[PDB]
Amino acid sequence: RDQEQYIHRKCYQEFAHCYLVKYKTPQPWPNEGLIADQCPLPGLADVSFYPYQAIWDYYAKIENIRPANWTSSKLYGKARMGSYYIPKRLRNINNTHILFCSDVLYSKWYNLQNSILQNENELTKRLSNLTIGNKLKNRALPYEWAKGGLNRLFRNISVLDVCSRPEMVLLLNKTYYTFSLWEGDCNITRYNVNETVPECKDDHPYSCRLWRYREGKEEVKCLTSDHTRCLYYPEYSNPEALFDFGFLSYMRNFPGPQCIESTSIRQQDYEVYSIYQECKLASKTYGIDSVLFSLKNFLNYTGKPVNEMPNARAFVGLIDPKFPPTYPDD
Ligand SMILES: *[C@@H]1O[C@H](CO)[C@@H](O[C@@H]2O[C@H](CO)[C@@H](O[C@@H]3O[C@H](CO[C@H]4O[C@H](CO[C@H]5O[C@H](CO)[C@@H](O)[C@H](O)[C@@H]5O[C@H]5O[C@H](CO)[C@@H](O)[C@H](O)[C@@H]5O)[C@@H](O)[C@H](O[C@H]5O[C@H](CO)[C@@H](O)[C@H](O)[C@@H]5O)[C@@H]4O)[C@@H](O)[C@H](O[C@H]4O[C@H](CO)[C@@H](O)[C@H](O)[C@@H]4O[C@H]4O[C@H](CO)[C@@H](O)[C@H](O)[C@@H]4O[C@H]4O[C@H](CO)[C@@H](O)[C@H](O)[C@@H]4O)[C@@H]3O)[C@H](O)[C@H]2NC(C)=O)[C@H](O)[C@H]1NC(C)=O
Ligand SMILES: *[C@@H]1O[C@H](CO)[C@@H](O[C@@H]2O[C@H](CO)[C@@H](O[C@@H]3O[C@H](CO)[C@@H](O)[C@H](O)[C@@H]3O)[C@H](O)[C@H]2NC(C)=O)[C@H](O)[C@H]1NC(C)=O
Ligand SMILES: *[C@@H]1O[C@H](CO)[C@@H](O[C@@H]2O[C@H](CO)[C@@H](O[C@@H]3O[C@H](CO)[C@@H](O)[C@H](O)[C@@H]3O)[C@H](O)[C@H]2NC(C)=O)[C@H](O)[C@H]1NC(C)=O
Ligand SMILES: *[C@@H]1O[C@H](CO)[C@@H](O[C@@H]2O[C@H](CO)[C@@H](O[C@@H]3O[C@H](CO)[C@@H](O)[C@H](O)[C@@H]3O)[C@H](O)[C@H]2NC(C)=O)[C@H](O)[C@H]1NC(C)=O
Ligand SMILES: *[C@@H]1O[C@H](CO)[C@@H](O[C@@H]2O[C@H](CO)[C@@H](O)[C@H](O)[C@H]2NC(C)=O)[C@H](O)[C@H]1NC(C)=O
Ligand SMILES: *[C@@H]1O[C@H](CO)[C@@H](O)[C@H](O)[C@H]1NC(C)=O
């Protein structure tokens, strides 16, 4: 009978937006610190005027009370306080692949105003028209991922993505771009702002000023004998007062300084395989049930199922996975 529809339905409901990205070589995120001023911060006492930003999971939050001989490096490595600390598990040299199940990276053909029927149909059509086996043609990808890219399935990643999808950016960005209003970045100080920024000849109170000024060396001062409760002094100024300065500056709400520097993270072409296309292909040989079982287990490669992870966060690193998985000969 026309088995095709059952295989489509099952493969789609389990693996539609699941993909496997192979780095040319294992190259992890290179710094412990992430400078992303474009994301709003929680602000004073966390009474936040913005919805929860996922990147806040990695926020190096300044605390006023610290023990007597406390340094930021004890908790956040080389990261700046008030920026973000990338934990070791998100910059792991051993990780050769990135597995994700998310629709946030589809280009404009996919848009949630349409009926789900349209989007389902269009995605399966495009995948069939864009795959050699289970491997995507380079034209499906961003050119930044693979030479020949024409965004025919995936969009380019953006500056604001890191705020809602930090793991995706950390694991998949070919290049790290800073967005900074910190004093000293790009040799911009509180003294030469009227000279480095063209449009400043000296209105929003945020105009032509920096966000974080360097106040001095980081230190802990103890004014009691109680050395467990001492006062912390950050190196740069505290951003709670001006919690959305960087975001508002990124939206070009006012003129002023902006520092953007690039760092090449991963070189050479990505390869990308569609788990859905592999489901549909292997089903005609080994049967839908075993293909389903084996690819579900592959999605559980780390003990946490990637497709049971939130759509914005379902991006995981893998160490030398066998793909396709062995299919049971039953
Ligand atoms: C994960 O990966 C993601 C994907 O890889 C990644 O997303 C990408 O991030 C990067 C970095 O953020 C993005 O690239 C940036 O794009 C910026 C914006 O580009 C547009 O706007 C600028 C400015 O536009 C002004 O001028 C035009 C005319 O020129 C006007 O039409 C505008 O209206 C505007 O005019 C004024 O008005 C605005 C308010 O309305 C003001 O805000 C504005 O500042 C003006 O005052 C244009 O220049 C751009 O033109 C480009 O157009 C296309 C591409 O769009 C190209 O074909 C073309 O060649 C132009 O590049 C565009 O329209 C850019 O500003 C930004 O450029 C800076 O960074 C790069 C990389 O380092 C530099 O090479 C570049 O020269 C710029 O660096 C200078 O400026 C920065 C600060 O901006 C300094 O820190 C730096 O030191 C340097 O200064 C030196 O040079 C200056 C000359 O520029 C000089 O003046 C200085 O004095 C100094 O000597 C950069 O290109 C990219 O778009 C993202 N991609 C996507 C798909 O989103 C993501 O970030 C990654 N995430 C993480 C976490 O890593
Ligand atoms: C990249 O992979 C290597 C190899 O898997 C990782 O090194 C290994 O790290 C584990 C802990 O994550 C070590 O296991 C421990 O070994 C001690 C013996 O000293 C044992 O008593 C513990 O119960 C535990 O099993 C393992 O020794 C270590 N192996 C080597 C060769 O270094 C490495 O950490 C990975 N890198 C990253 C950044 O994750
Ligand atoms: C996603 O990112 C890529 C960059 O890797 C963008 O590709 C670039 O797109 C621009 C405009 O579409 C191309 O420039 C144009 O070239 C033609 C040549 O005929 C010229 O007539 C135009 O005036 C303009 O200069 C550029 O070549 C192209 N670069 C590459 C490497 O393909 C792409 O547009 C981005 N898409 C989105 C939606 O952000
Ligand atoms: C993805 O793989 C992980 C294995 O890394 C699976 O976790 C396993 O989940 C089962 C279900 O509860 C656990 O079995 C039970 O464990 C308890 C306590 O250890 C034991 O007393 C019971 O007799 C029973 O065997 C199992 O321990 C656990 N394994 C680990 C290492 O945590 C997970 O279920 C898999 N997810 C999917 C969707 O398949
Ligand atoms: C999708 O399939 C079409 C087949 O129609 C591929 O090529 C298109 O061919 C028609 C003529 O039949 C041209 O008019 C189109 O311009 C072609 N498409 C493009 C995008 O140029 C197409 O390459 C396949 N891939 C995608 C991503 O659509
Ligand atoms: C900042 O100054 C240093 C030298 O002190 C120089 O190497 C660097 O390129 C400068 N950066 C910018 C953005 O001007």
Numbering used by the authors: 218 to 419, 427 to 554
Excerpt from the publication:
Recombinant RBDs from several simian FV (SFV) strains were tested for production in Drosophila S2 insect cells, and only the RBD from gorilla SFV (strain SFVggo_huBAK7422, genotype II; abbreviated as ‘GII’ herein) was expressed in high enough yields and formed crystals. Crystals were obtained for the RBDD, as well as for the untreated protein (RBDG). The RBDD diffracted better (2.57 Å) than RBDG (2.80 Å) and the structural analyses presented below were carried out using the RBDD structure, unless otherwise noted. The NAG and MAN units built only into the RBDG (and not RBDD) structure are indicated with red frames. A prominent feature of the upper subdomain is the eighth N-linked sugar (N8)18 attached to the α4 helix residue N390. The N390 side chain and the first two attached NAG residues are buried in the RBD, rendering the EndoH/D cleavage site inaccessible, which allowed building 10 sugar residues in RBDG and 8 in the deglycosylated protein crystals. The N8 glycan emerges from a cavity that has N390 at its base and extends upwards, remaining in contact with the protein and preserving the same conformation in both crystal forms. Structural analyses revealed that the glycan establishes extensive van der Waal contacts with the residues underneath (buried surface area of 803 Å2) and forms hydrogen bonds with main-chain atoms from Y394 and I484 and the side chain of E361. N8 is the only N-glycosylation site in SU that is strictly conserved across the FV subfamily, and the hydrophobic patch residues laying beneath it are conserved as well.
